[PDB]
Each structure stands twice: as C-alpha cells, then as structure tokens.
C-alpha cells in the first residue's frame, strides 16, 4: 500500500510517518487516524484540514496529495519536505541563519499567509514547527488542522487558539472577535526567533505570556490601543512597563527589518500591518 | 459583476471577490437531481430540510451549519442514484453532523445526532454515512452558502466610515427577516436553478430595492430577474403571515442571536407559495 520507510512524530490527530508510493516510488508524509478510537468519527480538525487543502493551492502552502480510507484507518497523504524550520534552527547548519535567508523565508511566509487571508482562511497555529523547508530554499505553511475558513464579516470562534508563545495579545485579553491579524502576530514572533535563534516570548502561562509582551513593547493604554481597558481579561492591576528599544533585541537585523518587526508586533490588531502590506515593505525591496 | 467590497487593507478587494465568485463555479447544484431518484418526491426533500432546521434550533446550531448541511445533502444526492426514501433521514442528519463538526466550536456529540432520529439512525450508521458523503463530495465541504451571501450583502449595506469588512456591523431584524424568506425558498428544490448569491440577492431585493440589491451584490436586474419572479409567491406568503421576531437562546449573547438557526411551520407556507 505505502512503504512506511520511517516514523517522524505525532500530530493534532494520531501519528506521522515518512513513506513511499509503490506504483510511483514517490516520497509522501502520512497522518494516520484510527477511526476505531474516534467516538465522533472523522475529527473536526481533519475535516477542516482536508477541506481547506482540497482548494488552498500555493507554492508556500504544503500540498495534500490524497486521502485514503482503508479498513478503519483514514490516511492524509501530504508531499514530503526534508524538515521543519524548528528542527533546522536546532541543527548545526541552521544554528546561525544568514540575513538573506531570514528575509527569503519571511517573504515566503508572508506570501503563503497573504494567500490564506485573501482565500478567507486563518491558520491560527503559525510557529517554526509548522513551516516545512525543502532542499532548494522554499518554505511552506503546514498543519491546517487548527485553521478556519472565516466569513466576511466573521463571528466569534474558538476562544483559546494559537500555541502560547506565538499567541497575539487580543486573544490573551479575551477579545470577542479576532481577525487575520492573529496570524501576523505569529509571523512577527517567528521573524524575531529566526534573527535571535530563540522564542521572543517563551511564557509559562497566559499572564506570564502577557507580561513578557508588555515588558518588551510597553503596557498598552487607551492611547496606544483604544478599547484595551474594556477587554474581558484586562486588569488595571497590570504593571506599567515602558517600551524597550528594538535595536537592543535584534541588533544584527538591518533597520528596515526592525521597522517591519515593529509593525508585525503592534499590540492593537486594528493597527497591525497586513501580510499584503508587509510584502510591499522596504525590507524586501532591492 | 464588479466588486461591491470597499478597499481592504488585508487583500485586493477584486481578487477576494473573484475567489468568492469562482466558488459558485466550483460548487455545482442541480434543480433536477431527484430525476436520478425517480420514486422520490420534492416534498420529501422539503420535509427532511425543515426537520434539520428544527434540530438546529433545538441545539442552537448556526444558520451557516444548517446551510452547509443543506448544500452537502443536495450535492451528495446529485452524486447518487435510486436512494430509497427511508435513508433520507440518515443522509440529512449525517450531512448536519459533518457541518456541525466543521462550523461549531462545541458541536453536539454523535449520541445527540442519533438521539434526534428517535431510533431510525444509530451512531454507527451516522459514522458510515459521513464517510460516504465526504468521499462522494471529494471533501469539497467549503461552499459559500445562501446565508454566507446574505451576511456579506448586509455588511456592505451597513458599512461604517472605517470601511471595516471583518467586524460585523448590520442590524439583526433585517438579517433574520431576509433569512426567513431564504429558509422558505430552500425547501423548494427549484431554488437550485439559481446561484446561491442570486438567491440571497433576490430575497434581499424583495425586502428592499433595486438600488440596494445592486449596491451590495454588484448584480444587474437581468442577472436576478428570473430568480426574483420565481421568488414572488414565497415573498408574498412571508409578507401575509408576517415576519418572526428575534429569539433569545440560552447561553447565546443576545447580540449574536441572529446567527442561530430558527424553525417555524414552513411546510404550510411552502404549500401556499407553490400553490400560486
């Protein structure tokens, strides 16, 4: 059926494997769902990932090759890419990312995200582990299990979304609505992590996460973020930290890169740059 | 048709629209699909969809969830032949199970989808059917629904000075009044002759004007004329019976209540409307 050459981790649903198609010899990555163990049948995350990737096709988005239902297992067949950005940065070649590669990876990331948003899809789990790199320099968004096709206009969705370290402050403060802006926040965090080699905001809790952000960017006010005091999990009792200069955090980053990072990490989702606008930024100009 | 959307910060408004219009080309409907099931009667589809709307109101499911289920049911039946009438309930409740897992935060459990069938459909029968449906549809489970088009038209109608498109800002009463006409129309399989965006534009026209229909939809009269004329008796029966008030739902913010699927005796209304 599929020659399961190797296992390569666990996932949102079931377990993940490298493999080969026998009638082609082509490499694929396999997500296995054990339908026997699923009281609710095909999990919502898998129905969402499959349906979204059936139509969301772009050079900077992972391809879903097939869906195979055999016995009481459902297999999602994705294109095989060599590794994710996290495994790359954790390995010797990748310990020190060249400035040109940080830029070409970020550009691609923004292209993929811009295509999602223009297609009314919000990823809601952008982090290095979910960005797959090939041997030629391409980077692609993966794991659309946490994504949602949004309405125009949208409504209230799952309250607690995005891996904690990549989670935008409008989510941490319990805003009723969040937008495509939550993806841009995650990209800001990923950009800083490529430059510094470590997570920008490695919180151990929602409040710790919120405090690490305020320490770096300063405590938001009605002046810098209108409506923030009205947000459900906002408290007057927050310390009033003051905005650190960004040159101190990412000194090896060129000034136009630091400008872009600062626009990506605007705490007011209303003022946060879009992926489309980020792609027009001078950082990317020749 | 040109884009009724304002300039967007997050995309090219003309691309966003082109992508939405391409959906109506990718997701096909066939007003004659019951010719492939020659001993089924259109009234059987009406009864099944009316019943799904009732289940939706009981469990406070979104209108989006109901219209996903309706689309899944209609597209799935168009892929099959000779389905016996005793399986329509299983196909409908399995379509709604898929829609609910897609669209709701905390969908009802499988046991509630079985429960509401009063013994006709087991959990295991629903898990078998959901895979049959999703494979027959090739996992194309992202249509732009009838109600998604009403949502976008209402947002364009009421657009604020900031041209905000993603944060909802239309009134609730106009929304549910138009949705109620759409819920009646969708019970008639002839509705599937019209693109979903045209069905929505047409029900909006019946509650407003040519000027508003054109502004929010970008359609010209010639595009919607046949749909508008087909919808006349449905609009009349709704105007004569009177429009329903906004409901309160347990645990739903009263400002989000307009998004919850409702149910009234629409089979009565449907008879009157098709009579003319």
Swiss-Prot record, chain A:
SMART domains: S_TKc. It comes from the Eukaryota. The keyword Nucleotide-binding applies. One of its GO terms (cellular component) is nucleus. Residues 2-284 form the Protein kinase domain. PANTHER family: CELL DIVISION PROTEIN KINASE, CYCLIN-DEPENDENT KINASE 3. This is Cyclin-dependent kinase 3. It comes from Homo sapiens (Human).
UniProtKB/Swiss-Prot annotation, chain B:
It is found in: Nucleus. GO terms for molecular function: cyclin-dependent protein serine/threonine kinase regulator activity; kinase activity; protein kinase binding. Ubiquitinated by UHRF2; appears to occur independently of phosphorylation. GO terms for cellular component: cyclin E1-CDK2 complex; cytoplasm; cytosol; microtubule organizing center; nucleoplasm; nucleus. GO terms for biological process: cell division; DNA replication initiation; G1/S transition of mitotic cell cycle; homologous chromosome pairing at meiosis; negative regulation of transcription by RNA polymerase II; positive regulation of G1/S transition of mitotic cell cycle; positive regulation of mesenchymal stem cell proliferation; protein phosphorylation. Highly expressed in testis and placenta. Low levels in bronchial epithelial cells. The modification Phosphoserine is found at residue 3. Keywords: Cell cycle, Cell division, Cyclin, Nucleus, Phosphoprotein, Ubl conjugation. Belongs to the cyclin family. Cyclin E subfamily. Essential for the control of the cell cycle at the G1/S (start) transition. Interacts with CDK2 protein kinase to form a serine/threonine kinase holoenzyme complex. The cyclin subunit imparts substrate specificity to the complex. Found in a complex with CDK2, CABLES1 and CCNA1. Part of a complex consisting of UHRF2, CDK2 and CCNE1. Interacts directly with UHRF2; the interaction ubiquitinates CCNE1 and appears to occur independently of CCNE1 phosphorylation. Interacts with INCA1. This is G1/S-specific cyclin-E1. It comes from Homo sapiens (Human). The gene is CCNE1. The chain holds residues 101 to 376 of 410 of the full protein.
């Amino acid at each position: 059926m599929f020659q399961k050459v190797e296992k390569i981790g666990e996932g949102t649903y079931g377990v993940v494997y490298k493999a080969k198609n026998r009638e082609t010899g082509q490499l694929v990555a396999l997500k296995k769902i054990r339908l026997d163990l699923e009281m609710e049948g095909v999990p919502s995350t898998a129905i969402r990932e499959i349906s979204l990737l059936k139509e969301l096709k772009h050079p900077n988005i992972v391809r879903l090759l097939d869906v195979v239902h055999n016995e009481r297992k459902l297999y999602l067949v994705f294109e095989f890419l060599s590794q994710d950005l996290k495994k790359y940065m954790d390995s010797t070649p990748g310990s020190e990312l060249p400035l040109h590669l940080i830029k070409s990876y970020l550009f691609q990331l923004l292209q993929g995200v811009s295509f999602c948003h223009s297609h009314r899809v919000i990823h809601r789990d952008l982090k290095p582990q979910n960005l797959l790199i090939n041997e030629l320099g391409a980077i692609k968004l993966a794991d659309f299990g946490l994504a949602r096709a949004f309405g125009v206009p949208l409504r209230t969705y799952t309250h607690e979304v995005v891996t904690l370290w990549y989670r935008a402050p409008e989510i941490l403060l319990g805003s009723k609505f969040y937008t495509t802006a939550v993806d841009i926040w995650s990209i800001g965090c990923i950009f800083a992590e490529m430059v510094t080699r470590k997570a920008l905001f490695p919180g151990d809790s929602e409040i710790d996460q919120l405090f690490r952000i305020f320490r770096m960017l300063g405590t938001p006010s009605e002046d810098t973020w209108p409506g923030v005091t009205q947000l459900p999990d906002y408290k007057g009792s927050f310390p009033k930290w003051t905005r650190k200069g960004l040159e101190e955090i990412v000194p090896n980053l060129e000034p136009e890169g630091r400008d872009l990072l600062m626009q990506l990490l605007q705490y007011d989702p209303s003022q946060r740059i879009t992926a489309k606008t980020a792609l027009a930024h001078p950082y990317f100009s020749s | 048709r040109g884009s009724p959307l304002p300039v967007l910060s997050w995309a090219n408004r003309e691309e966003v629209w082109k992508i939405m219009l391409n959906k109506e080309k990718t997701y096909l409907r066939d007003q004659h699909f019951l010719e492939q099931h020659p001993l089924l009667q259109p009234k059987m589809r009406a009864i099944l969809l009316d019943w799904l709307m009732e289940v939706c109101e009981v469990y406070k499911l979104h209108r989006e969830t109901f219209y996903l289920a309706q689309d899944f049911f209609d597209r799935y039946m168009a892929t099959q032949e000779n389905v016996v009438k005793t399986l329509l309930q299983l196909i409908g409740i399995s379509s709604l199970f898929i829609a609910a897992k897609l669209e709701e935060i905390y969908p009802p459990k499988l046991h509630q989808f079985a429960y509401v069938t009063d013994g006709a459909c087991s959990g295991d029968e629903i898990l078998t059917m959901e895979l049959m449906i999703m494979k027959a549809l090739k996992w194309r489970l992202s249509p732009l629904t009838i109600v998604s088009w009403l949502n976008v038209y209402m947002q364009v109608a009421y657009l604020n000075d900031l041209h905000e498109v993603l944060l909802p800002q239309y009134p609730q009463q106009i929304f549910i009044q138009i949705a109620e006409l759409l819920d009646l129309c969708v019970l008639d399989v002839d509705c599937l002759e019209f693109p979903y965006g045209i069905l929505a534009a047409s029900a909006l026209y019946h509650f407003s004007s040519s000027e508003l229909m054109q502004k929010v939809s970008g359609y010209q009269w010639c595009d919607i004329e046949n749909c508008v004329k087909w919808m006349v008796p449905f609009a009349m029966v709704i105007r004569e019976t009177g429009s329903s008030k906004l409901k309160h739902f347990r645990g739903v913010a009263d400002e989000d209540a307009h998004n919850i699927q409702t149910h009234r005796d629409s089979l009565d209304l449907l008879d009157k409307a098709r009579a003319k």
